[PDB]
Ligand binder design. Sequence first.
Ligand SMILES: [Ca+2]
Lengths: 76, 275
Amino acid sequence: SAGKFIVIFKNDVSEDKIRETKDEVIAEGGTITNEYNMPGMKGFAGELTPQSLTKFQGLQGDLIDSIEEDHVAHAY
Amino acid sequence: AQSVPYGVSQIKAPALHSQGYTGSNVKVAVIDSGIDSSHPDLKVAGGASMVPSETNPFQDNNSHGTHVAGTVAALNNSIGVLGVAPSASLYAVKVLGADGSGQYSWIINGIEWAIANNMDVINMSLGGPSGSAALKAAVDKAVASGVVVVAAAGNEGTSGSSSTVGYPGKYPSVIAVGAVDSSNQRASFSSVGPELDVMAPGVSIQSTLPGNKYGAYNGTCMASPHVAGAAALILSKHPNWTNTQVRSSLENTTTKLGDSFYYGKGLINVQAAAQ
Ligand SMILES: [Ca+2]
């Protein structure tokens, strides 16, 4: 695994493509740990294999609005 | 007997309570380590947990979330303390585990839940030093959806002329809250920077703790809920005001303190903000 990431889709990406994307992440060997489905903000979080990470980074501006490492926040 | 923490009086919340404004029917999501729903001085309306290994949002294994919740809405009765908005509907949105940490992905799911469940106010007494496009999108979406979003500015103190405000507090859509003591002096640990919006009591703040306990905690994470509670008081009087109206009033009625880099617009005055 390349690590934990958060991926947000461009808003013109269809529901089928969104589903297809996540199924692919799992098929490659990754995981889906959270999914976001708000008007104007769709995406997911999970562990990504390197090939998925680079694919999403390359699709920035097309399929992907943003792809980033999943950071940690604290109560202090 | 019930005690009114100095911070509640400092922001002038009692004046509104006496007028019948206590945050009734206002939904406040405490995005934190959960809330001990069994505390005699707290009433929890609902919630959800985004922490994989801790699925119960009503079990606060840290204590932080329960303390924050008490500052927002400890019940007005004959025991414990008194919250800023004692009649507010509290929602425990657990995104931090027992160790006080949580993934940004969980926090975002918590914000999504808050939006989906029509929360009026979100309080995030937490933060991280790393920026996040997704986290910004989430808080921006909540604000665009009409939610008043409040967060602790951070406890990183000063660092020359550099901002020390953490995320999500650092985002423009969020109201970043710094901490002052009972003398309106900025706490040494209170984060600073142009992203600091307002100040609230954050030193030795007495509130509810799990297991029918009470105690004084330090932090801009104690200051933040004073502002979240203040937003609830304002909405209980002006239920039709947009979050923009609530925020504008809070920031325009502060008691000016020191330089904005260190005190933002100053100490909130909810009595004045309630117009
Ligand atoms: Ca009480």
